[PDB]
Ligand binder design. Structure first.
Ligand SMILES: [Zn+2]
Ligand SMILES: [Zn+2]
Ligand SMILES: [Zn+2]
Lengths: 249, 137, 58, 117, 62
């Protein structure tokens, strides 16, 4: 009973378009041996489905699809609670929506339907609730101004290409930090500056599976959007524009 | 208070998928010089470019430099939004803004609006103008 | 976006309605035709940018 | 830099919106109503001129010389045709309230020359 | 017009200007007042005629 529990978790958290066969093989070998255990596995499946993370739901539906066709007992239990499976898989419940990922939710629904036609074609007549369900989906839901620009000093930093830095920056070079005077060989004239740079060089030498909702936001493009689209920022956008409106008027 | 819209003379958004051969001809020298040293990767560079030119008189009046402007925008937008600036000696001071790896065009439009509205380069906020004079009383 | 949007108030209409919808109701559904009715000179770009958000919204 | 004007679709006569084909990265203008699309040449999507550095001569019209209200002078001859008379006024518009620069319009018919000293 | 006002090509209209203003003497005032009262009279007449028709008897205009 412990082993079957571990397999169910692994398939749901595999995070792949297709579940690993070896594990599915193991589940199957466990299911037949005992009918009671097969029922327990069925039970587990629905529970996994009723949680979250449609990708895990989509992975769960792959398990459900396999155990339907090859097991009459499982084939009965799915029919016995086909209503719940209909909301969990197709997302037909008016209240509960399909959780993220959205693309995974699309795959879960699309893959779910294609089963149903085959589900109904091969087993529609025998199982009367299934026949009603397929018909239910198909038919019901379908001035100083001091200006001076003297630029004579150069960064003269030693680049990895062997050439000195020719950037003309007043105070700080972005690629090398603070700017200090250097000779023709790019060595700081102040011995203290040479020692500090050596210390900086020494410091440099010293130096489930699916993305969660927080993890999905953890990126570049989302961070800049969060800063731009902010309640305070938009108000500051309006407040700044209001002040020029006063100047315009 | 000196916001960005204040110093910016004009703002323009282009499509420049090739930084090596930029759309604007009067940038090739410094843009290629900047892109020689790979401090930032070229693969992550977004193809949409926001090219903002500043006003030199506002430069001198506010004593604002290119290094300070780049530092402020970098502190505001991380390594996500990289910006490249020319030296403070050309006849036209212009710096480019690109995102780094809704359409990117509209995203860049919103970014430009946000910068121009509430990008505090210097000065205390909620202070509009400071009048400077000798008291005769 | 955050562009300026042109919107109209019609009597006996409970909710405020964009002008482009009004022009489509009057029978000018082509954006070009709406532009001819709105701006008379097409070589003036500023007006065209100013009416861009209404076309985008509708 | 210059300004950018809108483009119209040749099928439904609707505006072309900016769009891009990642395969070739060639500035495309694709109409979002139908499937029509076009290849741009301006390579510019949006410009915002804060300094509004534009010429008021473009907005000045040549039919204003027939106004019996504006003043006239003979000390600023028209450069295009040499006519002595000219009608002058200020910019008298927003973002041009200052700059009292006088805008002269030639009075002689069929010339309508507008200039500024 | 709204656009030209927005770009500043045209000046915002002022209410104090008498070109934008009109005067309302006895003529329009009485006409407007009468118009409301004449309609009230029409309604009264319609109410009387409707009640008489419902009762089944024709109504005298006087
Ligand atoms: Zn350097
Ligand atoms: Zn079209
Ligand atoms: Zn002339």
């Amino acid at each position: 009973d412990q082993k079957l529990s571990k397999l169910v978790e692994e398939l749901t958290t595999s995070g792949e378009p297709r579940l690993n066969p070896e594990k599915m093989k193991e589940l199957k070998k466990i299911c037949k041996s005992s009918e009671e255990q097969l029922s327990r596995a069925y039970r587990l499946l629905i529970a996994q489905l009723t949680q979250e993370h449609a990708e895990i739901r989509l992975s769960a539906f792959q398990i459900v699809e396999e155990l339907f066709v090859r097991s009459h007992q499982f084939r009965m239990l799915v029919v016995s609670n086909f209503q719940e499976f209909l909301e969990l898989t197709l997302g037909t419940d008016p209240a509960q929506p399909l959780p993220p990922p959205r693309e995974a939710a699309q795959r879960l629904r699309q893959a779910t339907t294609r089963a149903v036609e085959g589900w109904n074609e091969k087993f529609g007549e025998a199982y009367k609730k299934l026949a009603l369900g397929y018909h239910f989906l198909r038919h019901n839901k379908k001035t100083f101004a001091g200006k001076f620009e003297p630029v004579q000093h150069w960064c003269r930093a030693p680049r990895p290409d062997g050439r000195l830095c020719e950037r003309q920056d007043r105070l700080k070079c972005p690629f090398h930090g603070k700017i200090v005077p250097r000779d023709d060989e790019g060595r700081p004239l102040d011995p203290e500056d040479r020692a500090r740079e050596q210390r900086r060089q020494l410091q440099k030498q010293e130096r489930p599976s699916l993305t969660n909702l927080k993890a999905q936001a953890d990126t570049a493009r989302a961070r800049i959007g969060r800063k731009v689209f902010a309640k305070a920022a938009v108000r500051r956008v309006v407040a700044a524009m209001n002040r020029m409106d006063q100047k315009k008027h | 208070h000196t916001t960005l819209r204040k110093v910016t003379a004009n703002t323009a958004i282009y499509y420049d998928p090739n930084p090596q051969s930029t759309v604007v001809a009067e940038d090739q020298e410094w843009v290629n010089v900047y892109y020689e040293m790979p401090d930032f990767d070229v693969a992550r560079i977004s193809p949409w470019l926001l090219r903002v030119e500043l006003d030199r008189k506002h430069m001198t009046d506010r004593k604002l430099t290119m290094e300070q402007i780049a530092e402020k925008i970098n502190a505001g937008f991380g390594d996500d939004l990289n910006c490249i600036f020319n030296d403070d000696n050309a006849e036209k001071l212009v710096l480019r803004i690109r995102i780094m790896n809704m359409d990117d065009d509209v995203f860049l439009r919103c970014i430009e609006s946000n910068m121009l509205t509430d990008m505090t380069l210097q000065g205390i906020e909620q202070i509009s103008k400071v009048y400077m004079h000798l008291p005769q009383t | 976006a955050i562009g300026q949007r042109i919107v109209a108030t019609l009597p006996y209409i409970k909710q405020e309605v964009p002008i482009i919808i009004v022009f489509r109701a009057l029978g000018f559904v082509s954006d070009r035709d709406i532009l001819e009715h709105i701006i008379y000179d097409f070589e003036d770009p500023e007006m065209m940018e100013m009416v861009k958000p209404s076309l985008d919204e509708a | 830099p210059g300004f950018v004007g809108i483009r119209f679709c040749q099928e439904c006569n609707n505006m072309l919106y900016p769009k891009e084909d990642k395969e070739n990265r060639i500035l495309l203008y694709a109409c979002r109503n139908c499937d029509y699309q076009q290849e741009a040449d301006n390579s510019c999507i949006y410009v915002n001129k804060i300094t509004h550095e534009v010429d008021e001569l473009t907005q000045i019209i040549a039919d204003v010389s027939q106004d019996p209200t504006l003043p006239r002078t003979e000390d600023h001859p028209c450069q295009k045709c040499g006519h002595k008379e000219a009608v002058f006024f200020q910019s008298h518009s927003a973002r041009a309230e200052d700059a009292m620069r006088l805008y002269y319009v030639c009075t002689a018919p069929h010339c309508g020359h507008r200039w500024t000293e | 017009r709204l656009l030209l006002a927005a770009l500043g090509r045209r000046e915002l209209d002022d209410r104090d200007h008498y070109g934008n203003k009109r005067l309302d003497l006895a003529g329009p005032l009485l006409a407007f007042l009468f118009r409301g009262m004449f309609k009230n009279l029409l309604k009264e007449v319609r109410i009387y005629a409707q009640k008489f028709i419902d009762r089944g008897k024709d109504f005298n205009l006087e």
